[PDB]
């Protein structure tokens, strides 16, 4: 799963 970027839904 993605830690990612809160801005990418």
């Amino acid at each position: 799963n993605p830690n990612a970027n809160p801005n990418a839904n």
Epitope: P2, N3, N9
Partner: antibody, heavy 121, light 114 residues
Framework: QVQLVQSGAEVKKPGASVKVSCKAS????????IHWVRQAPGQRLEWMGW????????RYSQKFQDRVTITRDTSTTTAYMELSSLRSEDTAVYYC??????????????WGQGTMVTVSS | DIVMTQSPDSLAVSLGERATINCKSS????????????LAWYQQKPGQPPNLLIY???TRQSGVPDRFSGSGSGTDFTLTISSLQAEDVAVYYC?????????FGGGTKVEIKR
């Protein structure tokens, strides 16, 4: 017009600290996270961290050994990034930006103009 | 971390020709829950901040010309400029926003042959 405006270039001596500002306007400040990315001369973009403007939670890159500190002032709709124990490798252009704000209805991506920091005596 | 690697480091083509940039990720960027590739392409001209071109690996943001397109899945992606224009001189970066820390490619310098 979503817009991000950063403070001006500065010179700092080795071992000192620097704090860069990022004024946000044209949108609901607290609903998005503001990232900080630097670009050393002749080098690739390097992610440092981000802060959710609402709850103020932060996530930092381990590669900076926790000498980065990202904070946020909601009333001034402004985000800050402080980098301490400056070394020669920290000379770079420091950007704040709303990276990849993706929703089914609309998507956008906004950056500040950059802030050049030179570590020199 | 997720290392991003681009090929070539630089390329030169004539005006109106096609230009392509490859980007590989050290591990997969496709998320199985929504089947979307957390990959983006950025354009950066000298003295300016990057400019988003493609997100979700193949979706082009509203203000970008049609000649820009992206393809790929998982660990291998390609940026395509179908008809290079003079104003396309820039360093192009691929970027993964899948795992922390977010990482960018080494950049690909695009030049015009004149």
């Amino acid at each position: 017009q979503v817009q991000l405006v950063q403070s001006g270039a500065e010179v700092k001596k080795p071992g000192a600290s620097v704090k860069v500002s990022c004024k946000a306007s044209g949108y609901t400040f607290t609903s998005y996270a503001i990232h900080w990315v630097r670009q050393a001369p002749g080098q690739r973009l390097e992610w440092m961290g981000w802060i959710k403007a609402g709850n103020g939670n932060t996530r930092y890159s381990q590669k900076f050994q926790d000498r980065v500190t990202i904070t946020r002032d909601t009333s001034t709709t402004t985000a800050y990034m402080e980098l301490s124990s400056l070394r020669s490798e920290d000379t770079a252009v420091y950007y704040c930006a709303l990276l990849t704000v993706l929703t089914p209805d609309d998507a956008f991506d906004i950056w500040g103009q950059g802030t050049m920091v030179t570590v020199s005596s | 971390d997720i290392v991003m690697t681009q090929s070539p480091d630089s390329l030169a083509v004539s005006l109106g020709e096609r230009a392509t940039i490859n980007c590989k990720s050290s591990q997969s960027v496709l998320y199985s829950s929504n089947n979307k590739n957390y990959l983006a392409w950025y354009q950066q001209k000298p003295g300016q901040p990057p400019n988003l071109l493609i997100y979700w690996a193949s979706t082009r943001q509203s203000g970008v010309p049609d000649r820009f397109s992206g393809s790929g899945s998982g660990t291998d992606f390609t940026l395509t400029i179908s008809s290079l224009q003079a104003e396309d001189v820039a360093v192009y970066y691929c970027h993964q926003y899948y795992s922390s820390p977010l990482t960018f490619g080494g950049g690909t310098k695009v030049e015009i042959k004149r």
